[PDB]
Amino acid sequence: MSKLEKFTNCYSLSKTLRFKAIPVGKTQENIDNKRLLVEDEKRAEDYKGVKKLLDRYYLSFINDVLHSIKLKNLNNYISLFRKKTRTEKENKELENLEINLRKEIAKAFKGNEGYKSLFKKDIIETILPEFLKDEIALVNSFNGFTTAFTGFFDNRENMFSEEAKSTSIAFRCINENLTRYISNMDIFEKVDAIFDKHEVQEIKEKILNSDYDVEDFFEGEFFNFVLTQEGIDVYNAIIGGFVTESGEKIKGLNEYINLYNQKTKQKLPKFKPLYKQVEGYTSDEEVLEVFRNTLNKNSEIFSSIKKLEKLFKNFDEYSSAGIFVKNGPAISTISKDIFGEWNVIRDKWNAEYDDIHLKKKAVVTEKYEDDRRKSFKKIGSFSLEQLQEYADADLSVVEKLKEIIIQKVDEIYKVYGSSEKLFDADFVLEKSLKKNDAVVAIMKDLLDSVKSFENYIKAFFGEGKETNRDESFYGDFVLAYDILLKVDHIYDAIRNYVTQKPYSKDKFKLYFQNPQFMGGWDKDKETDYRATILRYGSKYYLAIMDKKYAKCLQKIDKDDVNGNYEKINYKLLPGPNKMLPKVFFSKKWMAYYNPSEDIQKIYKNGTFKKGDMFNLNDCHKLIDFFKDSISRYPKWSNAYDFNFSETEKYKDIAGFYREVEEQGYKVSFESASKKEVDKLVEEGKLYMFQIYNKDFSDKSHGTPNLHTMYFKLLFDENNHGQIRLSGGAELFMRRASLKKEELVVHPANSPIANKNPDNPKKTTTLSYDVYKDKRFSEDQYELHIPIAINKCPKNIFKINTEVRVLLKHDDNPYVIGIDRGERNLLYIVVVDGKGNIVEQYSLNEIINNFNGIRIKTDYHSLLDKKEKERFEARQNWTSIENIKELKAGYISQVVHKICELVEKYDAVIALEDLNSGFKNSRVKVEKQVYQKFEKMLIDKLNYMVDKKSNPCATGGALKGYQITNKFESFKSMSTQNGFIFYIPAWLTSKIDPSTGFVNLLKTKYTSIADSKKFISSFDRIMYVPEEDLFEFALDYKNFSRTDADYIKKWKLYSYGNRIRIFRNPDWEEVCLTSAYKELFNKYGINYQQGDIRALLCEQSDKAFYSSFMALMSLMLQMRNSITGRTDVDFLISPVKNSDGIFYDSRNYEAQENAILPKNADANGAYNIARKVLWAIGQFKKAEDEKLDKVKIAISNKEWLEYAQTSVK
RNA sequence: AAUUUCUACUAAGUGUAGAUCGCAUCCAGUAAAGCGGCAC
Ligand SMILES: [Mg+2]
Ligand SMILES: [Mg+2]
Questions:
Q1: Ligand nearest to the CA of A755
Q2: Phi-psi region of A606 (alpha: psi -120 to 50; beta: other; left: phi over 0)
Q3: Nearest to A569 by CA among A628, A526, A612
Q4: CB A180 within 8 Å of CB A277
Q5: Number of CB atoms found within 10 A of residue A210's CB
Q6: How many CB atoms sit inside 10 A of residue A422's CB?
Q7: What is the DSSP secondary structure assignment for residue A724, as one 8-state letter?
Q8: Are the beta carbons of A462 and A325 closer than 8 angstroms?
Q9: Distance in Å, residue A11 CA to nucleotide B39 C1'
Q10: Ligand 1 mean position to A850 CA, how many Å?
Q11: Which residues of A1154-1183 are buried (b: 16+ CB within 10 A; e: fewer)?
Q12: Do A791 and A15 meet the contact criterion of CB atoms below 8 Å apart?
């Protein structure tokens, strides 16, 4: 059997199929006349309204708990906070005190005051009505329809967690609000006497309050007062100042500190206000009104930009030791902008970490580099002083930063000038915004220039309780920035609006004035649920009974004079493990049966269940009781065909239940007069809809949609309960959003150009009209039907363990390698159990089969035309969205290609772990699309079907492969998920497949001395006359950071030629030996002399050495690419194989499915696969029961050992 | 340029080929990675 075979019927999975519901006959007229719809439509309107009222009571609630709270954890907390640290994980004691501050807040919500009636049915039933007429009325409407608020309900209970999320109130109460209060205490202590006694308390004490005193709000025990919004407003008014209910405009503390510019030493810190807590879709008038309002030259966002300009202009005035830059991407970027390279800061910091941790004897090891890396990441931030500590003299870090920041503000001001007419009161919109390209680009330009300023500027927060900070700097900075933060919302909303499809998918749920509408199908509650399913020939229908006529479907003849619909009776026995004991210990059954006490005692004590009070006979007695009770229960034994296993072969009660559950459900069809119900439709006693997708069209002649097959199979004789119909069906109405007269149309009888350049037919002429987006021009009913797949699994085991066991015992196991490439969206390499390539090719082109005809689509050319489009459109939003969606389409094609390969080779899949990576600019499928791809792959593999197989066949629609576990998280895409193994890409592309040689030397020229050392660290350097080549023979031991190489000693030869970047005002090509001959001649070095390393070091000037190294580096540069030309991105290796000939990639370009990789893209997919072979190799070394514990994570050192020894 | 819906189409003439429970994240490979259904 194929390894694949053993993976069927493993676990249940549930899916919902969607269809269009086409109203038949007079149904729509009746629906309108009886006005059934409007009930469900206004609810849809007021939904948003009621939500606001729920937020109202939520906010009164939050302010009942918050008025009532005294933080106990706090006071230790304040003293520790002002303890000024002193670290050594003494602060660790405190970081656990923090969490308990949020813990105390969460529990105070939950703990008391009728929190419980919050996200359950009783909140809009009674609670909202008793809290605060035009609003009570809207809430009343929703009753028995509490469904509407479930997604809302989940979004709002995250409010009260200890989650340390920006969602949490507690995080807000303690994490942001409290720290500011503390930070302000230390400002208040330092800046006390600046206040005039009359000036100080007298205006503030009286006009802001007349209660309390100003001093109070800078005492630690006063914080709890400031948890609620009033105390927050009171606090912020003390800092900011007040209106005064008149002209008075009483001054705040910050103004006074400002007015102490009279000393003009100033830079005396100002207080930071406390965070209060707890767009434009609709119209162009709306979208424009917001842009004008938030971004004009006297808006507050523009005010905060001028202040930040003033602040940073005085950057020199502040203490570089007390100004921090958050650690993360901002460090790479600012490194680039300050010094001129990405990794500089990281590099200097590695130079300093080594000296401390790097033992002289010690040789750098992968772990060492991993741990040092964990340390860097862990560092929260860097002061400007520290950054200047890396600053080479003749560069000022603060000043270079000043010129960069100021530059960015100047770029905002120039972009304002270019957008100036848009902010005229006089301005009006000539064209619709989607129509109006020129305007949209003006808006995007400005938004981008401010967003980028914001996003860059945001870096100067060390995201820490940093011990010493320039509070004078961060007072001004935090005041101004917080407004600037406002841009991100505006930006997103405006972009979502432009980016929108011209049509809308908004819709509303239909109950037809019935809270319990369409709860179930199979169940005979049809008088209650009032929906059912009809069949006629090949067509299926949804039939909805009017309340006054529920039984109308009951009494219908099986008329055979001419024609009948088939009528649905669905039988489901739900949850036998709860139900069988519920029914059969019923008082009525108890009457029916004089059940033995032996049975009752077994149940009550549960000696049937597992749990070591279980008795097998007791279990069997229970079963037999149930079995026999089943014979004598009409409702069930006239519904289902029970065929029970012998009682003895049942291991546990659970074994018995699966059979009840399995046989528990039956579906079959009744017979009902077509003419009779047809008339029921006419009279409006019954409403009918055809359940439809294009595959039900009389002109559909192609292979159907997968979901179409699922739906039909529901009612096919061959389907023995593998896919089942479930309740929870919903009907929606999707109001039309396009007007038919306004659609783009290709008129009948005129040729339409075909767009696929690989389609050999150039035009199409149809005799009817084709309309863009036609389906959105009509009101549309849609029907979502839930199904159950593999509800009663027979094969239970751990999927990961079973994959390992089968791989352990397989003689020629096959692996599919997938890699993302530079010249190829995706590239695939199939390999046997020994590393021989069986298949290699690009997936740039997706080839489709219809009939016997194959037509391909080159998705890489598509992306290329769209990238040119993005260039022509100056990178506007919509092209960006078009590219994202194209890619998401492409990956739905690829999923199918991978499935065929898995089925074809019974192969395991090898994929990049995207939790270990380097971003590569060259590759076209970015991380975020690839992650989506990997999720989709896993999802398919949960149940994998080939549509063209006969459904009952293994791998067909009734026996899908389940070779993957359910997706949990992206973080969870690591190690192995069933047939999928996640591999790190380290050292899979730039490595000789033939030898496993990898360049581990550093050839950058550094110093004349270093170059000599380099040259000297070589064993030999000799020109070989016979083979006309230079031979560099080396030991990796003599060079640093080569621990991973297994074959230490490699001989390098000049042979072949290489493509060099060779930038000139950037490509040229270079031969290798010619360069070695040229350069040596150039300097008077005769090279026919053995071991010229002593000789070479005799040279006196950089020029020899600078160019010797550049020459060397190129030779070790295996991967070569012009980038104008698809034709070559080749791989050539400076090292001979055992047989003595060097690997070139171009010698494999010609062949089909050649033994070694054909280009560098292939090499990468090839080597990703070999790492899985390595993993398989570890399985083959372990005992069956240890397999689950074996480690798949190959280490650069294991990898190179494997790559270099397995080649032979 | 037709769709349950999406993407690419026109595929031989009202359609073709994949894919397709729902929402949120869609740009930072140093922040986040989860919330639903379903099932237990
Ligand atoms: Mg089809
Ligand atoms: Mg389209």
A1: 2
A2: left
A3: A526
A4: no
A5: 8
A6: 18
A7: E
A8: yes
A9: 10
A10: 10
A11: eebbbbbbbbbbbbbbbbbbbbbebbeeee
A12: no
Q: Strand B: which bases are under 7 Å from protein Cβ?
A: 1-21, 23, 26-31, 33-40
Question: For residue A1102, what are its two tokens?
Answer: 């950089």
Pull the structure tokens for residue A393: 């003299």
What values do phi and psi take at A1120, rounded to 5?
-125, 130
DSSP A745: E
| Distances from the Cα of A689 to the Cα of A229, A726, A781, A844, angstroms | 53, 19, 9, 43
Rounded Cα distance, A562 and A570, in Å: 26
Kindly tell me the sign of the dihedral angle through the C-alpha atoms of A351, A354, A355, A358: negative
Q: After which residues is chain A broken (C to N over 2.5 A)?
A: 132, 278, 1065
Indicate the residue type of A1142. Answer: F
What are the C-alpha distances in Å from A162 to residues A72, A157, A797, A821, A1060? 16, 11, 37, 43, 56
SS3 A133: coil
Per the listing, tokens 């720290």 go with A179
Q: Report, as residue numbers or ranges, the catalytic residues of A.
A: 746, 755, 772, 819, 912, 1161
**CB-facing half-sphere around the CA of A318: CA atoms within 13 A:** 29
* Helix, strand, coil percentages, rounded to 5, for chain A: 45, 15, 40
Q: Could you tell me the two tokens for A776?
A: 């959105």
| A281 burial type by CB count under 10 A (0-12 exposed, 13-18 middle, 19+ buried) | exposed
Query: Do residues A830 and A817 lie in contact, with contact meaning Cβ atoms separated by under 8 Å?
Result: yes
A702 CA to middle of ligand 1, Å?
5
CA distances (Å), A383 to each of A176, A326, A960, in order? 22, 9, 58
Count other Cβ atoms within 10 Å, centred on residue A489: 12
**Is-contact A287 A280, C-beta < 8 A?**
yes
Residue nearest to nucleotide B13 (CA to C1'): A766
Quote the distance between the C-alpha of residue A1009 and its chain's center: 50
For strands A531-536 and A564-572, give the pairing: antiparallel
Distance A540 CA to B14 C1' (A): 21
Judge whether A987 and A976 are in contact, CB under 8 Å: no
A724, A787 Cβ separation under 8 angstroms: yes
Beta carbons of A193 and A200 less than 8 angstroms apart: no
Handedness of CA A619, A621, A624, A630 (dihedral sign): negative
Dihedral sign from CA coordinates of A193, A195, A196, A198: negative
Amino acid at A1135: V
Bridge partners (DSSP) listed for residue A571: A666
Burial of A707: CB neighbours in 10 Å, binned 0-12, 13-18, 19+: middle
**A435 exposure class (CB count in 10 Å sphere: 0-12, 13-18, 19+):** exposed
- Coil, strand, or helix at residue A97? helix
Bridge partners of residue A21, in order along the sequence: A691
What method was applied to determine this entry? X-ray
Helix A179-191 with A471-484: angle, nearest 10 deg: 140
Name, in order, each residue with C-beta under 8 angstroms of A378's C-beta and a sequence gap of 6 or more. Answer: none
Residue with tokens 């990703």: A1168
According to DSSP, the β-strands at A815-820 and A908-912 are parallel
Question: Phi/psi of residue A1115, each to 5°?
Answer: -60, -35
d(CA A218, CA A222): 7
Ligand nearest to the CA of A774: 2
HSE, CB side, 13 Å, CA atoms: give it for residue A140: 7
Scored b (16 or more CB within 10 A) or e, A732-757 reads: bbbeebbeeeeeeebeeeeeeeeeee
Q: Does the annotation list A703 as a binding residue? A: yes
